[PDB]
A paper describes a structure:
Bacteriophage E217 infects Pseudomonas aeruginosa and is part of an experimental phage cocktail developed to eradicate P. aeruginosa infections in Galleria mellonella (wax moth) larvae and vertebrate models. E217 is a PB1-like Myoviridae of the Pbunavirus genus characterized by a ~66.2 kbp genome, significantly smaller than the classical enterobacteria phage T4 (~169 kbp). We identify and build de novo structures for 19 unique E217 gene products, resolve the tail genome-ejection machine in both extended and contracted states, and decipher the complete architecture of the baseplate formed by 66 polypeptide chains.
The first subunit, gp33, binds the C-terminal ~40 amino acids of gp37 and gp38 that extend outward, while gp34 binds the β-sheet ridge formed by gp37/gp38, generating a hexameric ring above gp33. The baseplate nut assembles outside the cap like a crown and remains bound to the sheath after contraction.
Author numbering:
A (entry chain F): 1 to 504
B (entry chain N), C (entry chain h): 1 to 152
D (entry chain W), E (entry chain M): 2 to 109
Amino acid sequence: MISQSRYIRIISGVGAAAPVAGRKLILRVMTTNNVIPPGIVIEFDNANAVLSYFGAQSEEYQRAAAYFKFISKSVNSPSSISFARWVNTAIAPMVVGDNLPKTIADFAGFSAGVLTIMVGAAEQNITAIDTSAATSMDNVASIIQTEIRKNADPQLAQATVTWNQNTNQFTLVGATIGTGVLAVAKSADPQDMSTALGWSTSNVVNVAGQSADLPDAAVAKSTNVSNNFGSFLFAGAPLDNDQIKAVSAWNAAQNNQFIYTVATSLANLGTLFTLVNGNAGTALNVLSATAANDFVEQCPSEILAATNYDEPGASQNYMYYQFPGRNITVSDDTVANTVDKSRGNYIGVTQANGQQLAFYQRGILCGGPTDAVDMNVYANEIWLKSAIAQALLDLFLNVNAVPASSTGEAMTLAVLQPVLDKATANGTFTYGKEISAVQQQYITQVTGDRRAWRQVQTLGYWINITFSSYTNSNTGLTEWKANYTLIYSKGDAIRFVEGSDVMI
Amino acid sequence: MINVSGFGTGIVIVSASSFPMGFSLSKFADDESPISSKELEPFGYEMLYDGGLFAFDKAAPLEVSVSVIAGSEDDINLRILLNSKKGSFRFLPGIIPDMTTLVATLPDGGRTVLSNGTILKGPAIDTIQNTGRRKGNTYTFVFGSYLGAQTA
Amino acid sequence: MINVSGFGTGIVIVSASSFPMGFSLSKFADDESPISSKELEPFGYEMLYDGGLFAFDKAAPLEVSVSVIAGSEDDINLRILLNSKKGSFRFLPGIIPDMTTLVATLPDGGRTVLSNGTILKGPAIDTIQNTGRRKGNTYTFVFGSYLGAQTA
Amino acid sequence: STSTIRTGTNNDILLDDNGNMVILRDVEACAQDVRAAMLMRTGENIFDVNSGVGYFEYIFSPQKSYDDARKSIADAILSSPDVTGIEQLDIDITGEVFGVDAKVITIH
Amino acid sequence: STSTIRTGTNNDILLDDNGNMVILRDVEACAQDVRAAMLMRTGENIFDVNSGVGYFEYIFSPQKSYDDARKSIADAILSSPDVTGIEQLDIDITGEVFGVDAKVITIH
C-alpha cells in the first residue's frame, strides 16, 4: 500500500562518521597474488570486504585485519586501504570482466550455436558449445576450455579457464609467456556467451603479456595509474638489498611524496644503513627472527593514516604508542644505542614483572643532513604541499586571467591565505621558538631580505611572490612564471624530559 | 630623498561567501582621505600604591576607513558587501561568518594582508552638497589579525 | 571622466492617507545641503577575554534630510505633511500610520525607493538671517526598508 | 617529622662501609620523597588508583593547553607528609626537552 | 543498558543464516531505536497520545516559523531510554527536500 521511502527517508548510520574530501593518506600494498590484475588498484572500506574478496587463509586478510583495528589518542581509524599488483615473472595474456553476481547457473537452454568471438592476433570464432546441462560452472568452464583447445591457434591451443567462487569472475589464460595480446568482441548472434559472460561487456579488464620488471618500475606505473595514498609497502617475501636500494632511490627522486617502510633484522642493519645513507623518505624497522612477523613495519603507516588534518591540534608524536598485538625485540641499553646509531625503529620493552610497557620508540627517519629527519615533519610537509598545489590549481581554473602585475601577486596572496590559516591552526607551524645565530644567517642567506627571522620567530612563517620570464624546452617560445619562497618553523614533539627541584 | 607618494596603490578584497573570488579597488575619492586608520593601543598601565609602574597586555582591534568615488563600480561592490545580511549564510559558526580578507600593495612593492574581519558601517544613498557635487562615500572595516607583512 | 553632477534630480513622495497620489519636489535650497543622510551601522563587534574578535548583527534605521526654498509649493506641502497628526484615522495591523514612500531619480538614470517611514522634524515658521533673507527650511525623515536599482 | 631509608642515584637501598642501613632525618628525606613522588607515574599504586604523574596522557601525548600537566605535577609534589606549599614551577618546554624546575617549602 | 531486535532497511525482523534472532547490544540499539522513533509520527500510538512527530501539522502544512518542527523533532529524538542530549540540528530546507541532520550523545 505504497512505501515509506517515497515520502520519508532516514539513512541513520553508526557514529564516528566523518565525510572527507581531499588527499587521502592511506596504506598501499604491492603484492604478488595472482588474482589482482596488473593494471588496476582496488580500495576497500572494511576488513570484511577484504575477507570476502581474498579469504581468511590469505596473508592480505591478516595484514588488513591488523591494520584496521587501531585507535589513536583522539579516537580515529584508518577507514581505508588500497592494493596493487607487482608481477614477479613473465605472464600470459588474460581477460576478466565480471564483478556482479551474474552467476546463478543460467546456462540452461544456451547450448545451441555458441558463437563467442575471440579477437586474437587473427580473428577466430568458436563452434557450438553444449550448456543445456548446466550441471556446474566448473564443468561448463572445462567444456569451454576443451572447445577452445579444439582451435588451432597457438595461443588458444593450450589455453586454460578458471572460476573463483567468493568473488565472481571468469578468466582466460594464454599459452605463451611474456608476449601476445588478446581481445574479445560481441556479435549479432542472439544466444552468445560473451554478453552473458563477464568479458566483452562494459568495464572489462584486459591484460597484455609482458616480461618481468623491476619493483621500482612497478610502483612507478602504479603511481601513474593513481597517486592517492601514502606510505606504500611490499608484502610477501623480503627483498634483497639491491632492490630495496633502487626503490629507495626512486622514492627519493620524488620530493616528499610518500614513505618507504621496510622490515629487517638486527644483523642486517649494518649493511643497509651504509647503502641507504641519505635518500630521505625511508623507514627502517627491526624484525624478530624467533617469533612471527606480526607485521611490525605497518606501524608508521597506521599512525599516519589515523591522522586528521582539518581539526585543530592535529600534529602527533611517534615516540609513545602501544601495540598490544606486536611482540618485543630489544631489552638492553647497548643494543638500543647501536640501533639508534644505525637509525632504526623498534618496539622496546621497559620492564617485566608487572604490567609491561613497550612502544614504537624512534620517530626518526633516514635521510641527508639537509632534509627533515623526524616523521611528523615529513607528514606535515606532505599535507602542506598537497594543499598548496590544490589551491593554486583552483585559482588557475576559476579566474579568467592572471595578469603579470601587482594585481596577480595580490590574488596569489589572497588565495594562499586560507591554507596558511588552516596550517597555523592545525599545528604544522609553531611560534615563539628561539633562533640561533647560524640559523639567522642561514635564513638571511636563503631570502635576500633581512629581518625575516623576526617574522618567523613571531608568526612562524614568511612568504613572498615574484614573477619573471623564461623559455621552455619543448617549444622555442617564452612564457611568464611566478616564484614564491616559503620559510616556516618546524613542528616538534616531546621526546625527553628534564627536571630539577630545590628545597629552598 | 624618500618617495612617500601614494600613486598606484591597489587593494584587493576577498570574502568567504559573498565574493569567493574577490575584486579590486582602484578609484579612490578625491576630497576624503582614501585610506586611514585609528592608532593601535595594545598595552596598558596602572600606578602602584608605592609609586612605581606596571604594564600589561590588552585586547585591541584595528579599524580602517576607505573612500571611493560615488557611482563607480567599486562603490557598488562595497554596497553589496554592506547590504549582505550576517544572519543568513548557513555555515560553520565561530569563525566570524563571512570573513573578509584585505590585501593592499604599495608603490614600492610593500604588501600587507589583513584577515579575521568584516565590513562595519557605510552610507546607504548618495549625498548632495551645496556646490552641486556628490560626496565621496566612505566605508569602515575592522580586523583582528595584524599579519605583519612589510616585504620589500 | 565620471559625471557626478546632481543637477536634474527629482523626488516623488507618496503618503498612505494625507497624500494618496503623491507630489513632486523640484526646488532645492542653495545655502544648505539638498539631500543629506547619516551613516548606516548594521553591524557591531565585541571582544573576548582571550584577545579574539566576534561580530554580530545590529538593528539600524536610516535618516534622510532635504531642504527647499522657503515660500515654494514644496515647502507648504511638507508643512502639511509635518502638521498631520498620527492620532487620527486608522491603520492595517503592523503597518504604521501614514507609511510614506520616497522615490529619488538620479540624473544619469539610476534610482532608489524607500518605504516604511515617516517625517519626524521640521521648521514651523520662517527664520530671517541678519543679511535680510530667509533660511532654507530643512526636514528630516526616517525609513526602515530600502532598495537599490542603479541601472538605466 | 619524617624519615626514610637512603637510596642511591638508582632507586635501590644504599649501604655504607659498615654495612648499616641509615635512616635519613628530615629535609633530606623530603628531597628523596619528592624525587620519588615525581618519578612514580600514575596507575601503578595498587590500593590507591588515580595517584602519580599522568605522563602518557598529559605530557607525551599531543595536548591542547599543557595546564593539566602543571596541575598534575603540582599535586604530585604535594601529598608528601612534610611539604607545605610550592613556590615556583617553570615548565620550560624549550627545544626538544620538556624542562621542569620547582622549589618547595617545608615546615623546617 | 538497552537492547532490541535487529531489523533490515525495511522495518521487519531480519534473520541471519542460522535462523536466529539477534539481540543487539547498546550503541547500535540506540541507532535503531532513534531511527524508529523519528519515523513514527504522532497521533497513532494508542495508550500514549501526543507522542511522535507532527509531520502533517508542522512540516508538510504551510507554516510561519518552522521552530515548532525543530522542537517536535528534538523531543522525538529524546525520550529514548539511553539518549542524553542533542549536539547538532540543521533543518536545511533547500529546493524541495527538507534536509535534517543530527548528532546524538549517549552515556556510552
